[PDB]
Coordinates of C-alpha atoms in Angstrom, one line a residue:
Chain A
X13 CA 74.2 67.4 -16.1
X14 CA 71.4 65.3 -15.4
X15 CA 68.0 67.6 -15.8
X16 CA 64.5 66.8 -14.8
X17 CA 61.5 67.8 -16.9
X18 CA 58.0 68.7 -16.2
X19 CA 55.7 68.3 -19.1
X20 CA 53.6 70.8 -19.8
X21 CA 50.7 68.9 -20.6
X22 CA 49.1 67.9 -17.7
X23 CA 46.5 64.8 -16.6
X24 CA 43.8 66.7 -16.8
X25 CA 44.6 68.4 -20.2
X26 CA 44.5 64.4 -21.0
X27 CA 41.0 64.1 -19.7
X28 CA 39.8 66.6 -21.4
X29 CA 41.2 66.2 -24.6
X30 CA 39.1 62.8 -24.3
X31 CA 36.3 63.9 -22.9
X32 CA 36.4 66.6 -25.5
X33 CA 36.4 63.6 -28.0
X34 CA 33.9 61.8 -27.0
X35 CA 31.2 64.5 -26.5
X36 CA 32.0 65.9 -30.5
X37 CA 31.0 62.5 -31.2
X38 CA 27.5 63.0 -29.3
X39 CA 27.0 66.3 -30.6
X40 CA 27.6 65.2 -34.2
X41 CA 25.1 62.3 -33.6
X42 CA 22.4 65.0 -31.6
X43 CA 23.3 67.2 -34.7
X44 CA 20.3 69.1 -35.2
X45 CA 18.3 67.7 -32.6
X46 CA 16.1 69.7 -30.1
X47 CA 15.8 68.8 -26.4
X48 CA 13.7 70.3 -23.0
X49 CA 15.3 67.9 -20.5
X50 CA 18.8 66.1 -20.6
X51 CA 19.4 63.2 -18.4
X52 CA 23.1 61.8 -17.8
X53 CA 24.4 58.5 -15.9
X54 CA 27.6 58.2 -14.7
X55 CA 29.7 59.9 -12.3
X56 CA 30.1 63.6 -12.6
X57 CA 33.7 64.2 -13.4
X58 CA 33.6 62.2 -16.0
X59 CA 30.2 63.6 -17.3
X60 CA 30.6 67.4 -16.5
X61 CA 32.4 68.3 -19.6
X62 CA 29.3 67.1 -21.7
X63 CA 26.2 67.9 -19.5
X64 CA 28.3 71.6 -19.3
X65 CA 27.9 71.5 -23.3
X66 CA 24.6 69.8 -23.9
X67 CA 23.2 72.2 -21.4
X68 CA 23.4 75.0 -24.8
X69 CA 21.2 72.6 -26.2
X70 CA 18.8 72.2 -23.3
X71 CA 16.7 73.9 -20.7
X72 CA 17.3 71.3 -17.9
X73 CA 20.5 69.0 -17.2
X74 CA 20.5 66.4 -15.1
X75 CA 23.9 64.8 -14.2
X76 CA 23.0 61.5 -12.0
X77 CA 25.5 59.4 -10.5
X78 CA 25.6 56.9 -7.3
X79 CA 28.0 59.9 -6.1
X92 CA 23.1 71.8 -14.6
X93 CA 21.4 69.7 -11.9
X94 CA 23.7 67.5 -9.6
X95 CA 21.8 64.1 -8.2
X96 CA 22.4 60.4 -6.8
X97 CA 20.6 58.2 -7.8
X98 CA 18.0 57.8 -5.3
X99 CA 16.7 61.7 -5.6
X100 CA 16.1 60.9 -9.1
X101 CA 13.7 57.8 -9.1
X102 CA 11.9 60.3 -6.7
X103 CA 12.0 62.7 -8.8
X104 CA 10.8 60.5 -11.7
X105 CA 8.2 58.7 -9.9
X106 CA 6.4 61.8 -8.7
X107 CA 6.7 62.8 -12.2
X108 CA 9.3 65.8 -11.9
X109 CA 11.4 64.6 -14.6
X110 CA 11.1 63.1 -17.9
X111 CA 14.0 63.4 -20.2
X112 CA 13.5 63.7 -24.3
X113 CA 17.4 62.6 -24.2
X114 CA 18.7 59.9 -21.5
X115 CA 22.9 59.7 -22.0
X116 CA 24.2 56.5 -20.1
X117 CA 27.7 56.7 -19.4
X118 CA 28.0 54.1 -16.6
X119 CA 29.4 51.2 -18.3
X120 CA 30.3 47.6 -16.6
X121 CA 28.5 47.1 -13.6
X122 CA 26.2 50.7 -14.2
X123 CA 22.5 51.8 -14.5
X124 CA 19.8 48.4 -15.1
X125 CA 18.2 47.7 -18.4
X126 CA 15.3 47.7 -15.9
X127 CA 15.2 50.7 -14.6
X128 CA 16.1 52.4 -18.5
X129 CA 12.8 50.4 -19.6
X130 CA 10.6 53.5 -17.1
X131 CA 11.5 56.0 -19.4
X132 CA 10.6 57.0 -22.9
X133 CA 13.3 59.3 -24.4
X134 CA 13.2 60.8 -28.0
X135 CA 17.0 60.3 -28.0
X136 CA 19.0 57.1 -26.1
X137 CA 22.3 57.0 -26.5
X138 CA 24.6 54.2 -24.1
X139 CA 28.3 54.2 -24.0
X140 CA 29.9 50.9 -24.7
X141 CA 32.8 50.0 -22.2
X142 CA 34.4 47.3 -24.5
X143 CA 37.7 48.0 -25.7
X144 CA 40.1 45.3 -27.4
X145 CA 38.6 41.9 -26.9
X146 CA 38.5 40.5 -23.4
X147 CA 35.9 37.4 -22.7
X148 CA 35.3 38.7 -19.1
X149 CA 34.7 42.1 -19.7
X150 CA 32.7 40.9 -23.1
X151 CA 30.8 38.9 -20.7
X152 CA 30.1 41.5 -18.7
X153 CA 28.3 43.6 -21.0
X154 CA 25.2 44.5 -21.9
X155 CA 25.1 47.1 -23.8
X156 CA 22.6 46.4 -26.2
X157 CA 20.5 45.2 -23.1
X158 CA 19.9 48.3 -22.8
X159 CA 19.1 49.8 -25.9
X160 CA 16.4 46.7 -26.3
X161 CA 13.9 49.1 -25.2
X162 CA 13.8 51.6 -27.0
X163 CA 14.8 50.2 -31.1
X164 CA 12.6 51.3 -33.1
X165 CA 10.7 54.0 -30.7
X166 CA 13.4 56.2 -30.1
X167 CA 17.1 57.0 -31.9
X168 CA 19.2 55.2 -30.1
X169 CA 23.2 55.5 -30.2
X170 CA 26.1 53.7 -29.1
X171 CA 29.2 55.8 -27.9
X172 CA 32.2 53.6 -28.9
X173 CA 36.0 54.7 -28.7
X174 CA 38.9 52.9 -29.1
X175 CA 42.8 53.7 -29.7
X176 CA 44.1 52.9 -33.4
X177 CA 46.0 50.1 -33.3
X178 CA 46.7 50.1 -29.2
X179 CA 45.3 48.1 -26.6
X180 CA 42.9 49.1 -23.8
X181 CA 41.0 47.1 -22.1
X182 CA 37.7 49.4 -22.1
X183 CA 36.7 52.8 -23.5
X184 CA 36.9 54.6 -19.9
X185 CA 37.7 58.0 -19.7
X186 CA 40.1 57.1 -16.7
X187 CA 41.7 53.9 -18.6
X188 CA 42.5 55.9 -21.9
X189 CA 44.5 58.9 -20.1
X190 CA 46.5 55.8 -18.1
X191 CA 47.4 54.1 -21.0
X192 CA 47.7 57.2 -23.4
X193 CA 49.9 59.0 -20.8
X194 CA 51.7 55.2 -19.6
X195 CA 52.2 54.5 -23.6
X196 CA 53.6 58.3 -24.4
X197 CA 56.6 57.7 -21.4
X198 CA 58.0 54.9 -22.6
X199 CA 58.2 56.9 -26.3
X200 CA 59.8 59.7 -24.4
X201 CA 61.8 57.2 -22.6
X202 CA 63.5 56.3 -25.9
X203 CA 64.4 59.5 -27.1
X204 CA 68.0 60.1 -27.2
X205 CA 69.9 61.1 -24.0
X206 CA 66.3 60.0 -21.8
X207 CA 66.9 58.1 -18.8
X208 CA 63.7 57.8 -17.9
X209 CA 60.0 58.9 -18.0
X210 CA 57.6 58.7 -15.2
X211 CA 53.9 58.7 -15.8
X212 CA 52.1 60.4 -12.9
X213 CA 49.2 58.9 -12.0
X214 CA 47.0 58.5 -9.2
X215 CA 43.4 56.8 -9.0
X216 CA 41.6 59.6 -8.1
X217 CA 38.2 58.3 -7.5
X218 CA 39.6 56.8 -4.6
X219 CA 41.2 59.9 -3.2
X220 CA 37.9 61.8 -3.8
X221 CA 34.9 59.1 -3.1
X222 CA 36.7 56.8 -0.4
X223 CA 39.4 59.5 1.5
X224 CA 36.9 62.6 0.5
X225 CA 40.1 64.8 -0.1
X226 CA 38.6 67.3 -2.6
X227 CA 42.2 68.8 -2.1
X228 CA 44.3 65.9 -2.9
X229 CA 42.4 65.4 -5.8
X230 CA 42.8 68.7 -7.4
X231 CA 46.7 68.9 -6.7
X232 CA 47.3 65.0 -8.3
X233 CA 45.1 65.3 -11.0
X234 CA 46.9 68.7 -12.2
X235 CA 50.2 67.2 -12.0
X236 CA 51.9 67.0 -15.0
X237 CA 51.4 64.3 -17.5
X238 CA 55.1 63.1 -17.3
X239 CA 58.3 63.8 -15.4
X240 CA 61.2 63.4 -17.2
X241 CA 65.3 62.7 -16.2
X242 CA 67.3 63.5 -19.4
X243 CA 70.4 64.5 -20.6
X244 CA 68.8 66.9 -23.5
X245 CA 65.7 69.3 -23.5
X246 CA 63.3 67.0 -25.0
X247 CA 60.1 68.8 -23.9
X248 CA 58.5 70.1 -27.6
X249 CA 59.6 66.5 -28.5
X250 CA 57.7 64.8 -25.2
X251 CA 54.2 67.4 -26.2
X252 CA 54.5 66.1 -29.3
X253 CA 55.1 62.4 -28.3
X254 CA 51.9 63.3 -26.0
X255 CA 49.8 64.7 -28.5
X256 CA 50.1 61.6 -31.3
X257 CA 49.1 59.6 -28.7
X258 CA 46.3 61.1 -27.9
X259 CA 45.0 61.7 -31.7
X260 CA 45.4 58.0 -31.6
X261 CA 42.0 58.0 -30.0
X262 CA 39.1 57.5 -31.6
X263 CA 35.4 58.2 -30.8
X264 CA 32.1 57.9 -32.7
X265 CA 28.4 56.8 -32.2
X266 CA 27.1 53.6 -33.7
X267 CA 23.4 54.4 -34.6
X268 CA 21.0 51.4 -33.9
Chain B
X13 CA 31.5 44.5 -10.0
X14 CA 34.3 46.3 -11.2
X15 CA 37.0 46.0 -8.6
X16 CA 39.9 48.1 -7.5
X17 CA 43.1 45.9 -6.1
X18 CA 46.2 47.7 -4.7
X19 CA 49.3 45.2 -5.1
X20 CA 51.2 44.2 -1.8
X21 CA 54.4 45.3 -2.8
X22 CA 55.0 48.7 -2.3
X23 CA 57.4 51.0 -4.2
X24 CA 60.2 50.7 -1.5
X25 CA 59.7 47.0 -2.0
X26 CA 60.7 47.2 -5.6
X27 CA 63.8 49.4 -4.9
X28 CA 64.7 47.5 -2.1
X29 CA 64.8 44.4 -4.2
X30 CA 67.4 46.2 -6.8
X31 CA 69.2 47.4 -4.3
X32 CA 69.7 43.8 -2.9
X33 CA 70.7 42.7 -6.6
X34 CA 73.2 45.3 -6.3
X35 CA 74.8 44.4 -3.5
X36 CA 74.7 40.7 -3.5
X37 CA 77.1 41.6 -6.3
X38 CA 79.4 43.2 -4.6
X39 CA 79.4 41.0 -1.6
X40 CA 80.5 38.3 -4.5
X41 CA 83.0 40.5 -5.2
X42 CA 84.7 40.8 -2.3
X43 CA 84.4 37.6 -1.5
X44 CA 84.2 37.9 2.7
X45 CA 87.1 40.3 2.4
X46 CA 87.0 42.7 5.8
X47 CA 88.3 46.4 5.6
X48 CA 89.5 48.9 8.0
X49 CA 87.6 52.0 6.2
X50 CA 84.8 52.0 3.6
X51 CA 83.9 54.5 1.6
X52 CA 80.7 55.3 -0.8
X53 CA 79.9 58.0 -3.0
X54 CA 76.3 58.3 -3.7
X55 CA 73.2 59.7 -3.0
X56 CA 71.8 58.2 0.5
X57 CA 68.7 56.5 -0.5
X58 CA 70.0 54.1 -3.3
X59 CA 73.0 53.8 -1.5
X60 CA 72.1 53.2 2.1
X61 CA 71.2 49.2 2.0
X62 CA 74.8 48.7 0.5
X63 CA 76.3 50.9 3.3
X64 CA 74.3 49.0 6.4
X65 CA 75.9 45.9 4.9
X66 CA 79.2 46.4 4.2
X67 CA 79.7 47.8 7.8
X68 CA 79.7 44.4 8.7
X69 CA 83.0 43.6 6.8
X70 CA 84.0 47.0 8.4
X71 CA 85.4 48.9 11.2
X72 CA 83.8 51.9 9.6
X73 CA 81.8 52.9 6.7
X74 CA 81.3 56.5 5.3
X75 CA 78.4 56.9 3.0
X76 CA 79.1 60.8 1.2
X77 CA 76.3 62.2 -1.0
X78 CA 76.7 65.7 -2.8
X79 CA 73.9 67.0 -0.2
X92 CA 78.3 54.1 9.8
X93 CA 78.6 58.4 9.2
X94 CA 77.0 60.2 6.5
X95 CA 78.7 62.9 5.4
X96 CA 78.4 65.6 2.1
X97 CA 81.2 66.0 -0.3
X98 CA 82.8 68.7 2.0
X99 CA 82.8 67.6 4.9
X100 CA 84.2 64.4 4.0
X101 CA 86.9 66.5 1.8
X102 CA 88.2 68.5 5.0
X103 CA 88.1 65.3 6.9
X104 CA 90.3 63.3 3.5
X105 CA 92.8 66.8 4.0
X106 CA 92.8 66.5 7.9
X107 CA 94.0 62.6 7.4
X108 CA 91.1 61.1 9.4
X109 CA 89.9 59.4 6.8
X110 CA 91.8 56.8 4.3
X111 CA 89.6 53.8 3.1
X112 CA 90.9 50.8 1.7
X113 CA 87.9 50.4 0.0
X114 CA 86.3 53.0 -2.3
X115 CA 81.9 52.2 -4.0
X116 CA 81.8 54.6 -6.2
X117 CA 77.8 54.7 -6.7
X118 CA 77.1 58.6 -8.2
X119 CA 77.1 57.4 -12.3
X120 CA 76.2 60.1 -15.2
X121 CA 77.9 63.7 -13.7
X122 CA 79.0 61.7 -10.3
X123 CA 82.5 62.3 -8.6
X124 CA 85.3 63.7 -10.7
X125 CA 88.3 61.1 -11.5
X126 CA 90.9 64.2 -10.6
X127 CA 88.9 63.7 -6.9
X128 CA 89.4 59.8 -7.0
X129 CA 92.9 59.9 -7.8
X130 CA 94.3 61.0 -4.5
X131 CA 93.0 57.9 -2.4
X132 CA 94.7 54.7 -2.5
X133 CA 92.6 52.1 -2.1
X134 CA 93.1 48.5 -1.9
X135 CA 89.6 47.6 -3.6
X136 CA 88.0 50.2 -5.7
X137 CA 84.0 49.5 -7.5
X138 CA 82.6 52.1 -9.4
X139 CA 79.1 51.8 -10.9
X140 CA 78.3 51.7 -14.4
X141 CA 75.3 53.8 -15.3
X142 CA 74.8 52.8 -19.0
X143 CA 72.2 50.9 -19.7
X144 CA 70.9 49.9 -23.5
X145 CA 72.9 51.7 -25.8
X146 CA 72.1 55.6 -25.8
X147 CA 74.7 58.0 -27.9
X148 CA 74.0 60.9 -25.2
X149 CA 74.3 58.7 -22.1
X150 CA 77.0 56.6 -23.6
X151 CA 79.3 60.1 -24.2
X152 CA 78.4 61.0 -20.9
X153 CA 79.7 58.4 -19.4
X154 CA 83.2 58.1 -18.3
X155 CA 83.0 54.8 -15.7
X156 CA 86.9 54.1 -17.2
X157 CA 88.5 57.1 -16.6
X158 CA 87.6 56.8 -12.6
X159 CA 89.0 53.4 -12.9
X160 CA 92.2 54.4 -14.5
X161 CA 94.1 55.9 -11.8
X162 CA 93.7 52.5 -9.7
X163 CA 94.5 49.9 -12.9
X164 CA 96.9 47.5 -11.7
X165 CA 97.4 49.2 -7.9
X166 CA 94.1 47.9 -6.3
X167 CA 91.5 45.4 -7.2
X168 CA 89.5 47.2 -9.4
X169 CA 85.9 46.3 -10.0
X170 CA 82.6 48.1 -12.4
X171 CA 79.2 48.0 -11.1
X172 CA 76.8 46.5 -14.1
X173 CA 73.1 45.5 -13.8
X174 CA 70.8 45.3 -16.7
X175 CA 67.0 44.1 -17.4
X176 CA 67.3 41.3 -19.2
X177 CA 66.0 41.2 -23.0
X178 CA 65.0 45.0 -21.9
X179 CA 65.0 48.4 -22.3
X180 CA 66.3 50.3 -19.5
X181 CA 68.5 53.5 -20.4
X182 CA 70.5 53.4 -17.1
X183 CA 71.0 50.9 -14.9
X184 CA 70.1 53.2 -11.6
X185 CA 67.8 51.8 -9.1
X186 CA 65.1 54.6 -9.7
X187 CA 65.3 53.7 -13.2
X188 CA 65.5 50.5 -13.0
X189 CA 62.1 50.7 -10.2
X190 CA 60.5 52.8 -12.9
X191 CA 60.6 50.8 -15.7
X192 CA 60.0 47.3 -13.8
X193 CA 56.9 48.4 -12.3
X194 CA 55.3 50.2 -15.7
X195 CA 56.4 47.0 -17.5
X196 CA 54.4 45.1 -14.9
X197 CA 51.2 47.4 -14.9
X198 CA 51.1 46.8 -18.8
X199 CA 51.6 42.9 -18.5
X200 CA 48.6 43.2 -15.6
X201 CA 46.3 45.1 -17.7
X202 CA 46.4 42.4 -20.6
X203 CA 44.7 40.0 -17.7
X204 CA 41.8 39.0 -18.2
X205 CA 38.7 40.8 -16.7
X206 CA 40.9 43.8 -16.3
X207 CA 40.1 47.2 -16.9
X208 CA 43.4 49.2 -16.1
X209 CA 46.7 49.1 -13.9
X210 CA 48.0 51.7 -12.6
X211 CA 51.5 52.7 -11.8
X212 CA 52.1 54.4 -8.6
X213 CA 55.3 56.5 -9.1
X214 CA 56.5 59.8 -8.6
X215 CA 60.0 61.5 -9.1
X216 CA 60.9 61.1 -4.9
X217 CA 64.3 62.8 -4.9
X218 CA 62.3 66.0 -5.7
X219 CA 60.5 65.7 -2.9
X220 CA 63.0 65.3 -0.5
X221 CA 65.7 67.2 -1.5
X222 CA 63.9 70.1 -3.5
X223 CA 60.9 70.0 -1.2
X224 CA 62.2 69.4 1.8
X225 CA 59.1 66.9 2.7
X226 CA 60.1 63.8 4.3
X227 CA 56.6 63.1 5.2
X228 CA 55.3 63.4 1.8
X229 CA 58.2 61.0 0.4
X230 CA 57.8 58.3 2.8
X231 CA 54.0 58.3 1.9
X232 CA 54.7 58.4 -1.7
X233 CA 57.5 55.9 -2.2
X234 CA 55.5 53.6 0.5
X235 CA 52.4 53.3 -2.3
X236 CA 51.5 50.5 -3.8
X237 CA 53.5 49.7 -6.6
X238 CA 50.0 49.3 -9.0
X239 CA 46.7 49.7 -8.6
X240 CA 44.3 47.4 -10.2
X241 CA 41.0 48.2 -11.9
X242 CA 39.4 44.7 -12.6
X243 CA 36.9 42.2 -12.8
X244 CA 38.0 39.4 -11.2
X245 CA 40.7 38.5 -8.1
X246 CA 43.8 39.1 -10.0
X247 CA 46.1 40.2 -6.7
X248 CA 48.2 36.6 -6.7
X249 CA 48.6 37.4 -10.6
X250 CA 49.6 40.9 -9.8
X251 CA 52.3 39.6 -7.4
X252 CA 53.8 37.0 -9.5
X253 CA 54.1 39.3 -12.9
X254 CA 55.9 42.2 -10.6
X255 CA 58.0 39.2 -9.2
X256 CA 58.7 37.9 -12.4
X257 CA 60.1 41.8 -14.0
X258 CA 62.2 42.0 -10.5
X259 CA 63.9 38.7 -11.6
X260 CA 65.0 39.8 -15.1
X261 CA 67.3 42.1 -13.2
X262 CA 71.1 41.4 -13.6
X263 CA 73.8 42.3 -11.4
X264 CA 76.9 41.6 -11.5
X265 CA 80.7 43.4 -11.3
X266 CA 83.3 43.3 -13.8
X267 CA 86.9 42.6 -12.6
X268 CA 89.1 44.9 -14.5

């Protein structure tokens, strides 16, 4: 009587569907712009989707994270001090706590654009900011960008990849949950930059983030409802570049 | 200087807490009253904790799930047919598409609790339901009891444990995440009876449902916090049982 429910959507069908956002928002910003050498902070799973796509638009990609060209960090401020690499367009994608304004002031990109981690108004994580510490160096000298998404109407504490699946997918079970005949929805997540940077399980990565969004435990077939459910809520997402 | 903060309480802590409610009622209930045979229908996991302690009010306890002695449904039939087994008191604890009442009617029991599974008013659920038409057959011959436990000024749409665990903790990963300096809470959950029973993996339940209840992206110490707001969702969880 009682039936269990799978969604077909799955978490990373979530992260892509942002990450899909977020880098139409950079292309329409880079819209008709040229570049030899592509540089992106961040870490990589988060920053794939785009250096994959910029990387039509570019001879060289550079994806550099504290763990297409992979790097850490440290290979790179080699590579930049010997003179190996120096990128037309920088993309910084670190957010709270990522790549110094003092290490951004080395380089002299045609294009800068910085991702702002500020979501709905918190005076910690407003505090922690600086954004447009970053882009101080290069106003006026270069075009410099500010990647901004929010969700319409919702609250989320930043614009991270990783905290707008959790709350899109967290958000979408407790809609589902409502639904007629619905005893309950569970969202299944996992913080998987622990299972892959602390316990080093490429494995246990792959199989948790490809689980399905939601599980369900419902009287009636709710799925096409639940996709649906899924869907708005992502659409609810928002991304765009503020041009400084 | 971001943070990540897994909470103390662990999933089994949660539903171990609910189950506590649960039975606390039905110690109340029974008011210190000692039987020669108990029996309760259920499945073993959400079921178990009221089992262990009724067995000391009891010379025996039989906990039978549709899978002190634990039997399945059949074995615990033959043994009913063979006359080895005649309880005086009957927990009724399967809910939506449990134990049929034509089943329930050939015991005599001199307390008999069944549990009721609704929750917030759902048409589906509430049809389903038929909580009333186990308790008929004893009306007036036994002491006749119904299970009830809602979340207080809350949606739940059943009042099962998993449900109940599901909803408390999600509840408390939403209250988290509006904390200051936080970035995002996660809740750790996954559909467990799937992985036991379907699955056949013990090991990969007991490591699942062992998980910390949320995981905590954040700026500042917020683990105390953390405690007290799951705490606080535990307590808003009602138990109590209806004398008929």
């Amino acid at each position: 009587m009682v039936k269990t429910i799978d969604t077909k959507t799955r978490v990373v069908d979530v992260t892509n569907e942002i990450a899909k956002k977020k880098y139409q928002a950079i292309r329409d910003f880079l819209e008709g712009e040229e570049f030899k050498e592509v540089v992106i902070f961040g870490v990589y799973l988060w920053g794939n989707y785009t250096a994959q796509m910029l990387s039509k638009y570019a001879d060289k990609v550079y994806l550099v994270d504290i763990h297409i060209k992979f790097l850490n960090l440290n290979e790179f401020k080699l590579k930049f001090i010997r003179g190996e690499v120096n990128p037309d367009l920088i993309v910084d994608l670190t957010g709270l706590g990522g790549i110094e304004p003092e290490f951004l002031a080395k380089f002299n990109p045609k294009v800068f654009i910085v991702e702002d981690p500020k979501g709905v108004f918190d005076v910690d994580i407003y505090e922690a900011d600086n954004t447009y510490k970053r882009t101080a160096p290069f106003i006026e000298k270069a075009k410099v960008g500010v990647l901004k998404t929010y969700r319409k109407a919702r609250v989320s504490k930043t614009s991270g990849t990783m905290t707008l699946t959790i709350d899109t997918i967290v958000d979408a079970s407790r809609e589902i949950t409502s639904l007629d005949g619905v005893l309950y929805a569970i969202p299944n997540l996992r913080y998987y930059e622990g299972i892959l940077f602390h316990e080093n399980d490429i494995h246990k990565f792959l199989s948790e983030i490809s689980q399905p969004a939601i599980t369900i435990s419902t009287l009636n077939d709710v799925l096409d409802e639940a996709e649906e459910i899924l869907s708005n809520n992502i659409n609810l997402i928002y991304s765009f570049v503020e041009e400084l």
